[PDB]
Scaffold this active site. Structure first.
Site, short mmCIF file in Angstrom:
data_model
loop_
_atom_site.label_atom_id
_atom_site.label_comp_id
_atom_site.label_asym_id
_atom_site.label_seq_id
_atom_site.Cartn_x
_atom_site.Cartn_y
_atom_site.Cartn_z
N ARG A 143 -1.49 0.89 24.29
CA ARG A 143 -1.77 0.63 22.88
C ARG A 143 -3.24 0.91 22.63
O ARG A 143 -3.60 1.67 21.74
CB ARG A 143 -1.46 -0.82 22.52
CG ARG A 143 -0.44 -0.97 21.41
CD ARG A 143 -1.00 -1.68 20.19
NE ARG A 143 -1.35 -3.07 20.49
CZ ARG A 143 -1.82 -3.93 19.58
NH1 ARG A 143 -1.99 -3.55 18.32
NH2 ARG A 143 -2.12 -5.16 19.95
N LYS A 238 -15.47 -11.13 29.27
CA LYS A 238 -14.76 -9.96 29.79
C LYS A 238 -15.20 -8.67 29.09
O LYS A 238 -15.62 -7.71 29.75
CB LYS A 238 -13.25 -10.18 29.64
CG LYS A 238 -12.37 -9.19 30.42
CD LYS A 238 -12.23 -7.83 29.74
CE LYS A 238 -11.15 -6.99 30.43
NZ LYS A 238 -11.02 -5.61 29.88
N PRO A 255 -16.00 -7.31 35.52
CA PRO A 255 -15.09 -7.86 34.51
C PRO A 255 -13.93 -8.65 35.12
O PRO A 255 -13.15 -8.12 35.91
CB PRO A 255 -14.63 -6.62 33.75
CG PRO A 255 -15.78 -5.67 33.91
CD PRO A 255 -16.11 -5.85 35.37
#
Ligand SMILES: [Ca+2]
Length: 314
Positions: A143, A238, A255
DNA sequence: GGTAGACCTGGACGC
DNA sequence: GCGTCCA
DNA sequence: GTCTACC
């Protein structure tokens, strides 16, 4: 012939090489693994996308990285243009040296590494990286890729067209800050992140000092840089880390999200010790991040990419 | 301070 | 086919 | 994942 995306075979005279073994770079492993979302393998083993404001198609052989550019008369890339490619892939940073060190201090990294060579970090533009990853929160790579695509077509400058693909440069701060941008993004399916994009564009331009404030974080410290980014809407630890690692030259940034947690638990039997919680949480994620830095060193982020990338590919 | 829950969206399961 | 998952 | 309401 002179139409459509090029291939090394089809238009020989239009490509140029850059010494680069697959041991030092694997396009198929870095370009679609969630660093940048703007490269597409239009032809087998051929990746096309925008790099330094021009469209390129890249492909590699065992010892060479083949490059072609679409800007005037079609010609091979110049040494200066190629340098932009070298900079984009930070080809000065030797991956063999890094893999060696990580492998030396981490028996597990060594095992995994053998099978996944050439995973390195792309040196991305601050802006594209900020907004692309603002789009990455609580969402999948497929996506994310589409969203960023629709976002660039709607607000980025039109570059050139190849086959039925029209390329766009990444949107500017002014453009993203524009009136009714959020509503437009909502229609393009960015969901609640539509608001973050608009809000962060305005925040940067109207509260932080503009482009210069972001581009100044490259001289700042990971700690400083990371704290600053977190101010922006939709940008947490993050997202901030990804930006730090992939655009602000902070190679120690790591991350922490679902992937690294699974890896930490399955491959290192890691558990939080100082943190209060036993599972994922602001305190624990930060701790996990520290664990990885002490394990791999100054380039932990790069190492993280290797295991992260080799995880997606399995 | 250190949690819970909701949150746009759509390809994946799993019944 | 649909509701829960999950990135 | 980020953000916000809440003990
Ligand atoms: Ca999740």
């Amino acid at each position: 012939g002179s139409e459509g995306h090029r291939t090394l075979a089809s238009t020989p005279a239009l490509w140029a090489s850059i010494p680069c073994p697959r041991s030092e770079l694997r396009l198929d492993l870095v370009l679609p693994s969630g660093q940048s979302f703007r490269w597409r393998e239009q032809s087998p083993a051929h990746w096309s996308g925008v790099l330094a404001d021009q469209v390129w198609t890249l492909t590699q052989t065992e010892e060479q990285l083949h490059c072609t550019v679409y800007r005037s008369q079609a010609s091979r890339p110049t040494p200066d243009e190629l340098e932009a490619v070298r900079k984009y892939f930070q080809l000065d940073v030797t991956l063999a040296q890094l893999y060696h060190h990580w492998g030396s201090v981490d028996s597990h990294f060594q095992e995994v590494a053998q099978k996944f060579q050439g995973v390195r970090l792309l040196r991305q533009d601050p802006i594209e990286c900020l907004f692309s990853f603002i789009c990455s929160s609580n969402n999948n790579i497929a996506r994310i890729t589409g969203m960023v695509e629709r976002l660039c077509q709607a607000f980025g400058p039109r570059l050139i067209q190849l086959d039925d693909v029209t390329y766009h440069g990444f949107p500017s701060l002014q453009a993203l800050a524009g009136p009714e941008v959020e509503a437009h993004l909502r229609k393009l399916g960015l969901g609640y992140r539509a608001r973050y994009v608009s809000a962060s564009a305005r925040a940067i331009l109207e509260e932080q000092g503009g482009l210069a404030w972001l581009q100044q974080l490259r001289e700042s410290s990971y700690e400083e840089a990371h704290k600053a980014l977190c101010i922006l809407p939709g940008v947490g630890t993050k997202v901030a880390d990804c930006i730090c690692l992939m655009a602000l030259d902070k190679p120690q940034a790591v991350p922490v999200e679902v992937h690294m947690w699974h890896i930490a638990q399955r491959d290192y039997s890691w558990h939080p010790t100082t943190s209060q919680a036993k599972g994922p949480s602001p305190q624990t994620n930060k701790e996990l991040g520290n664990f990885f830095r002490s394990l791999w060193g100054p380039y932990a982020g790069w190492a993280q990419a290797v295991l992260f990338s080799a995880d997606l590919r399995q």
